[PDB]
Write a protein that binds this DNA or RNA. Sequence first.
DNA 1: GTTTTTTTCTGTCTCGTGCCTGGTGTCTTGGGTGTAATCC
DNA 2: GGATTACACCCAAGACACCAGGCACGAGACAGAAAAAAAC
DNA 3: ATCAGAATCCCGGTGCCGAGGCCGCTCAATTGGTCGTAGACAGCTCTAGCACCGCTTAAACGCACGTACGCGCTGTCCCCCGCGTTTTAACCGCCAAGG
Lengths: 97, 97, 105, 103, 91, 95, 80, 78
Amino acid sequence: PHRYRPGTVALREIRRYQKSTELLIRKLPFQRLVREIAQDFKTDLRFQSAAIGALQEASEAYLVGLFEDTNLCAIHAKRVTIMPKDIQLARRIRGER
Amino acid sequence: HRYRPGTVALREIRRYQKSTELLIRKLPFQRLVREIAQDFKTDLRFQSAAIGALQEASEAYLVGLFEDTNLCAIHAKRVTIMPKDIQLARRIRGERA
Amino acid sequence: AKTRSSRAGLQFPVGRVHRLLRKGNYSERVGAGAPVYLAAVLEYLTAEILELAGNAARDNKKTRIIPRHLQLAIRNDEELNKLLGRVTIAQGGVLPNIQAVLLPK
Amino acid sequence: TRSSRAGLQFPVGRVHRLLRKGNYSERVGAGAPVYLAAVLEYLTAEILELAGNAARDNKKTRIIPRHLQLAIRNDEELNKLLGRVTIAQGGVLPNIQAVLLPK
Amino acid sequence: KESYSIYVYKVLKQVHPDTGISSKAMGIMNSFVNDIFERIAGEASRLAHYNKRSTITSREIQTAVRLLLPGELAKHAVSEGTKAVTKYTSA
Amino acid sequence: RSRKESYSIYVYKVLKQVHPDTGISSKAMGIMNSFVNDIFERIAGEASRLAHYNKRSTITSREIQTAVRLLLPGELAKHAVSEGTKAVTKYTSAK
Amino acid sequence: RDNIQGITKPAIRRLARRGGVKRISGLIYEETRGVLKVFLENVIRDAVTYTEHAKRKTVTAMDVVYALKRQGRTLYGFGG
Amino acid sequence: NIQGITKPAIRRLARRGGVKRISGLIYEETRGVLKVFLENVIRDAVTYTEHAKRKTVTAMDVVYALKRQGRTLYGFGG
DNA sequence: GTTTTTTTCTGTCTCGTGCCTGGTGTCTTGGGTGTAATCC
DNA sequence: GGATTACACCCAAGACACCAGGCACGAGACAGAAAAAAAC
DNA sequence: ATCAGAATCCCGGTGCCGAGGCCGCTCAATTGGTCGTAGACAGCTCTAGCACCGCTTAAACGCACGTACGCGCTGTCCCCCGCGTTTTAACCGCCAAGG
């Protein structure tokens, strides 16, 4: 059929997700991970939803910035495939060790 | 006779990681700072200790930015620096838009 | 004019700001011209950024400003972007950054 | 002096004065400067203890600031604390990427 | 616990007078305004304690606005502030 | 002659405690004075934010404790909290 | 337990696409999980400490706002 | 002017950074970024001294301007 | 795939009021600068 | 020319007395997201 | 390997200079005494955080499969290292100057 040797799929979904507004990680598993990390320093803590939404917002923004500088590291690497030490170099330069 | 390249540079890296004395000497640095300072309000006097402060902060600043740029180039499967490497590091830190 | 806001011809409450300074543990005493001055600066900043907000919202035939509009208007500015460098907006996202190595040529 | 009455080494009342003139609150409690002074005291104890070890390394008797920068850059939590901190006559880590060492 | 909503409405009608707004847009705006106010005020308090001046007048606010915002914004803001000082001082 | 400040003699004594056989340079003593300044300033700013996010204007030692373990990283912070708490006990147990 | 593994590969994909990343390697996902985890560790530690002094067993949005302002990763939107 | 920065100076900057091998356009790029750095620094420093109503920039104001850019430097009474 | 162009049903927003609380008018007094002179 | 001081002056702090706005709550309307043809 | 020889390390040496002791002041910590409300605390009330489940469905997972950027290799060509040769700011100094 119309199998399409690639190129339009990835960039088209980039166009869609940059036309987009809202989140990408869906709610419940992120919330449960938050509570598992939360169950480590003081037990049995309760939460309002807006805090969790802010956490999700800033989390996705943090990772978006990581991906942007990682992308520019890859472009300077004359590649399009990412690597882990790209992210390690990016966090090395950001001073967030 | 002739020595083989790369060696003397690393030997003086081992030498120049030792004395924390100021690399750029005083008078030309002072003239450059005065010339840039000329174009805000006319002919301001200066404390020499403040000049040493500017000199210290500038040299440490540039050394650290070189370290990140060098690690960028090491990631870039190369040994020699490029100006695009400085652009990449600055683009990660966020000086320029 | 009874109210100092009408005596300034502005839109912000000044005595609000003076009480904020007093209930700030900022200084011990606060003069008369500083709160007016700062409120005027605030009012200019609001009008200035809301200009870019108005044009950025008008870019999409929508009467209402959305957060994406605000982030777009900030990032399309230079002074505001270097202002808001450590700053993130809720429901923001980022700019269209399609690299030239990516389009099918 | 309250410092001796706390059995410590930092002057309480100077800190109590500086808390007042800092516009730090409206009122100032009794023993909060004692707690803060002890915090300062243990911090500088730990820092200069590592600095003393740094002088033990080079076999130097007077502390040079290079010792200070090195002892900052060795320990983990201290270096994460003073990440945005630089010092005149500081220098950096004697550090070589071995991928740039010759073969 | 007051927000700055109708202030925003009046600024908006003074600039783009046919423009609506969402709720959370107003929320981000007031977040913005509070951040800016806090940054300037704390920098002015630094001006006082770095300069041993027991109060703060408008001159401190002018130099602090210089210290925060870059050039064009700074100069236009200084202009607007001095114009407000002028019209309030005249009456 | 205006009287200027230093913290040199205090931390000097502390250095003499922890290392009796050790000298120091003057500039480094100034560096440590600046160090105390910086740490004190960050703590005090966190104390003012403690006040305004608690709508209170009294400062006790509890706020200093929570400020320190907000700013400093964990293990160092808990040791320092221990030192301060034992000092609180030794002082306030007597006059 | 294991909600760290609740992070899905297509979510990482979606984040890469809005992040603008084209090509995805396979050795990325758990590294991503670890970085995200350490991030949220420091965040929620500080937020819970702010709530420790609050003497209320429930953490608010305002708390997380103040804590992330303390990190300098400061986020608007929810007031604070 | 800006050309008072010598080539072996930026080379020594690479050496204390620990950088081995050097390209060409590095030099002028370095002078440019150093210039913009000093521009912002000395601009707000002279802003401090403008508020000081005095004709010499203090070392204190230099230190506080470094704090204002989040570039806190000890050593010289700050 | 993109995007445009109809209803629709529809969520928020602006008008609309009443309650209230901070904002305003002004003296005393005081200290907090204003300014100038004088060191340095 | 900046640091110190000292004499000036002068209006904020408060403290009380008078007050129309400021916001919470509703209503009905009104900009608006999508359903789904429907071209390029 | 392996020797010759640059490059660096490292040991008395002395010198000089500032760190540190030291010492006589005076001004803020102290000591003590007197109002006062901020807050530690008791207690009231209603919201909202939590847990749970049934139903819907769109979203993830596994695999089938080609395939095409990542990469190891190659040749190549060029242009920085470096060592040599002259350069020019820069240090204190001083004898003609006139004058």
